[PDB]
Design an enzyme around this catalytic site. Structure first.
Site, PDB file in Angstrom:
ATOM      1  CG  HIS A  45      -0.316   0.252   2.515  1.00  0.00           C
ATOM      2  ND1 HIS A  45      -0.051  -0.757   3.414  1.00  0.00           N
ATOM      3  CD2 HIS A  45       0.104   1.398   3.102  1.00  0.00           C
ATOM      4  CE1 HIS A  45       0.510  -0.246   4.495  1.00  0.00           C
ATOM      5  NE2 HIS A  45       0.620   1.059   4.330  1.00  0.00           N
ATOM      6  CG  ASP A  81       0.251  -4.139   2.653  1.00  0.00           C
ATOM      7  OD1 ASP A  81       0.377  -3.530   1.570  1.00  0.00           O
ATOM      8  OD2 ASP A  81       0.242  -3.559   3.760  1.00  0.00           O
ATOM      9  CB  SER A 161       3.634   2.131   7.324  1.00  0.00           C
ATOM     10  OG  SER A 161       3.052   1.159   6.474  1.00  0.00           O
TER      11      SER A 161
END
Length: 294
Positions: A45, A81, A161
């Site tokens: 993402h 992901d 992240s």
């Protein structure tokens, strides 16, 4: 130097900023050098919008020492992901050196490291709070998904992240994903996914043609069976309550999706089902979700 101050300072040169800009957009994340040729692992993402619209987005890697280099997408996996980027002909890369997430235990102290130069970059501290934690992830046109995650009370956010979850040996045990406990993608799944993305530009996962909802015989309740699917041909009926998939008990729809991906493609597997008060075992042969790359 502090105990976490040392571990963070030793892995900082291995964590990079990942920047993606278009005419009117900007999204930033973190990545980690996993290979000396210039291979960087991030979560899918972080780059999703650049991968979906590459003619308009410019992807750039920024290292600890300030350097700014263009990067290319080698491959990506929305199901786990994860994504792999490549920088070309850069020398003296401090490669991250990768641990074994199967050797991780609840209570292990960790650091969730974000890119040292990122705009809103963070570095947080916690312990491992749960292993094999199925977690749903839901910012582009990709599929929603679920992963067996390492759960931590180290805060995972936009700032760390895509960066590494680091043990007290300065080893990568996971990849942070923000897509208030945190969740990381275990490093053993990352090696498999990254190893096959580097060579083939894609991975292939098993699929059954099932979509479920969580059940009071609890488990995953079949909401729809696709036509021609393995569930089709194996005997799955809608409103079935799946309680085992292969060798994995299924507590809800989240564990179901995870359990399907651990199966073998083209090999028979038992699905244990609660059907109108009964228990029924069904044999289902999983198809590959990407049949041309299979």
């Amino acid at each position: 130097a502090g105990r976490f101050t040392k571990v963070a300072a030793a892995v900082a040169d291995s964590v990079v900023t990942i920047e993606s800009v278009s005419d009117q957009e900007g999204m930033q994340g973190s990545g980690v050098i996993v290979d000396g040729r210039g291979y960087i692992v991030t979560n899918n993402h972080v780059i999703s919008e650049a991968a979906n619209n590459p003619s308009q987005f410019k992807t750039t890697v920024v290292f600890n020492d300030g350097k700014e280099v263009p990067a290319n997408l080698v491959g990506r996996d929305p199901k786990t992901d994860l994504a792999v980027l490549k920088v070309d002909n850069v020398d003296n890369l401090t490669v991250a050196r990768l641990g074994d997430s199967s050797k991780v235990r609840v209570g292990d102290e960790v650091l969730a490291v974000g890119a040292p130069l990122g705009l809103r970059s963070t570095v947080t501290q916690g312990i491992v709070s749960a292993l094999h934690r199925p977690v749903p992830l839901s910012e582009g046109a990709d599929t929603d998904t679920v992963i067996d995650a390492i759960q931590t009370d180290a805060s995972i956010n936009h700032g760390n992240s895509g960066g590494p979850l680091i043990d007290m040996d300065a080893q990568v045990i996971g990849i942070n994903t923000a897509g208030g406990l945190g969740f990381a993608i275990p490093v053993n799944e990352m090696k498999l996914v990254a190893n096959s993305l580097i060579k083939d530009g894609k991975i292939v996962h098993p699929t059954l043609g099932i979509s479920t909802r969580s059940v009071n015989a609890s488990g995953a309740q079949v909401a729809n069976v696709k036509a021609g699917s393995p569930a089709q041909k194996g005997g799955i009926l809608e409103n079935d309550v799946i309680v085992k998939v292969g060798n994995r008990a299924v507590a809800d729809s989240d564990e179901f999706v995870v359990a399907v991906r651990q199966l073998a493609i083209g090999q028979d597997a038992p699905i244990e089902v609660v059907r109108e008060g009964r228990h029924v075992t069904l044999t289902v042969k999983p198809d590959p979700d990407s049949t041309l790359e299979h």
